[PDB]
Amino acid sequence: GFSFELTEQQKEFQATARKFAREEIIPVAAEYDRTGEYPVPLLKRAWELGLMNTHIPESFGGLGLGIIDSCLITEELAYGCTGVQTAIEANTLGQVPLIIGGNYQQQKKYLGRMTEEPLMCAYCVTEPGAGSDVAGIKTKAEKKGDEYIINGQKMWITNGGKANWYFLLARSDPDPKAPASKAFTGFIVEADTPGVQIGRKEINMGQRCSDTRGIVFEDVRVPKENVLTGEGAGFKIAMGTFDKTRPPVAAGAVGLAQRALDEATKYALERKTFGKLLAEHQGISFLLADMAMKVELARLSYQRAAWEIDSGRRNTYYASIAKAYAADIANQLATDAVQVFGGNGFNTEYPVEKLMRDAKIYQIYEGTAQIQRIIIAREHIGRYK
Template sequence: MTETATREEIHSLAKATLDGLFQFIDTEVVPLEEKFRDVLGDERKLFRDDGLLIDEVAEARLSVRKMSSQAGFYAMFAPEEIGGGGLPALANVLILEALYRKYGPGRLLIGWSNAFLGSPLVASFIDGPSHMFMSITDEVRNDVLPGLLAGEKTVCFGLTEPNAGSDVWGLQTKAVRDGDEWVINGTKQWITNAPYADHAAIFAVTNPELAAQHKGGISAFLVDASSPGYSSETVLPIMGHVSSDCGMITLDDVRVSNDRLMGEEDQGFMIGMMGISEGRLMIAGGCLGMSEWALDRSLEYVKERKTFGKTLSEHQAIQFMLAESAMEIFTTKQATLRTAELVDDIPTTGRIPVKEISIAKAVSVESCERVLDRAIQIHGGLGLSTEMAFQEGFRIARTLRIPDGTSEIQRRTIARQLLRGDVVF
């Protein structure tokens, strides 16, 4: 699909997918949200004392994943080689943009909400089948993939540690070979979906000398959460929330067989970057849609609300805020769609658009924060009300300046590429 489809065909494919997806959401997911409206809107009822979602909502999210899988949406962004839909990157961002433009933030059963709970509708590298599973052994393919593709099981992406975030080469988790097995010891922190995941992609140092030289030496293992020595009991509340889906993982002499290696031994860094790059583009598409959603709502409101005998739309200060948001949305959209096109072109060009992926992530997240901030300002007190989702969108956008590479790390990557001679725009 990716190699042969024209841009027009990809746009048509995204539109056709969206028609089905919107219908699926409106008939299957929105009624579930209505059923749990009281609980979903009140975090004191939504989370248990230990920070986990109450059982009814966890089950509702599981049922959305399974229904989405049966309807062919859940793994649509995962490669065909592992049983996914194989949609091109351009289709992915178009779909996420439209999804978030229509439904907005704060939708626990549809997408990002409550400090970045991943979407049960569509799998990504932080919770389900993704490009990271391209180089797996038959054991993982037969044993783990079916459950992930069906939405019955989930995975998490265990890279970050208490002393290694931006500086991935500082990983302290170690895996030591013992016959046909590896013994893993270490602690992971800020891992999305860790408290719920059935499996974890764990990144560990397997060759300290290579890792010290930044030449490899890190391997990725698919670890079962039920393994002796594995635990994920601490949930980490995030910015203005009672809880979140981020947690810690401790690995205490956890044994995995050699066939749980993802990709080549010592080459896990590349597997991790594959997931993170995919995540950066998905974040860009989602934030673009959230910005459009906020501007759409603002345009409706300014035509209705009157102050000093005029609608808000007649005040130039308000017009300027609308214009600023439109300018940022337009430039974000160009950056995001163009980057997705460059990703789809990799098989023919051989060029990985490292700089552009960082630009798309940074621009979309940072502009989304400003657009949501203006939407709050335009709506006055109503903008801050928890009944409106602007405050949740604002918090999501602010949060997203940290994961999948902070804004500073995106700039570091962009500058490094420029200084290496990548000055193509």
């Protein structure tokens, strides 16, 4: 039957993650937002505490944690700073592909190292000309003997300048009329390969401590052994990846939303206007309630999507609903949080305007709001067949 009870092991990860977020992230998060330095020390910690690369199988020195587990950890982390957290998350983004489409040699090689040093990796799909339209990418992969020559340009790559290796999706079928299901190939590319031209750190509105970059690939030679499953299987790998990664990204949005709520509640229970506490103005108490409603709903949705994949079933439909819902109410709570703070809310000396800046990517990265509806509509309708 139904059960919304965490396991003992889960409660302990959660506690560990919560302590780290509230005692180590939070007190330093504000400064990193202002400076935009890579939160190296935070990451070195996360790793040591085992709150990084959680999906890596035990056979490669990993913890081999499930999707439910990661979601649980994520939410706690995100609560502190999604700038920091997204960096951690990007590691999982590049790992999953290898986990579901790599061989022992590949995994042992590239996943193994992650388990030894606090190294970082990244996930290169997006190009200047195509983000949402994956089948629209043009990074070319040309076979030349026992090597593949990669020529293309990637954009908005998280951990782009700090990564040891990249998952890279490239078009390997020059036939313009080739199906998406056969036109692409997934590769593992070591960042120190000649032809790899890492661009400047991009300056964005939010999650400013995160490393986001543009990377150019000029005659990058990749050993055939670096092909994940085989030529043409890149699209399958990419899609399969989302089932596992989408629920955790939703969780991160919930942690943000939860942060916003906590802060707004604290303040509403302190500040006075017209002789009453903010929380005593029915207008405000109603706002807070609607805020609370949404957090709980969003949390439920990722849980549902996570349990599903952990149960070994395609969770596309549920996963897409969570990401979509979590992303929208992270944005609504952020702006409502700034609102209860009044004048102080718009000021850089309070923790909420940052929340408002951060939350916005959730509606864009890893499947925009619109794309999510496309997917839900397809999965929904598909059921009437």
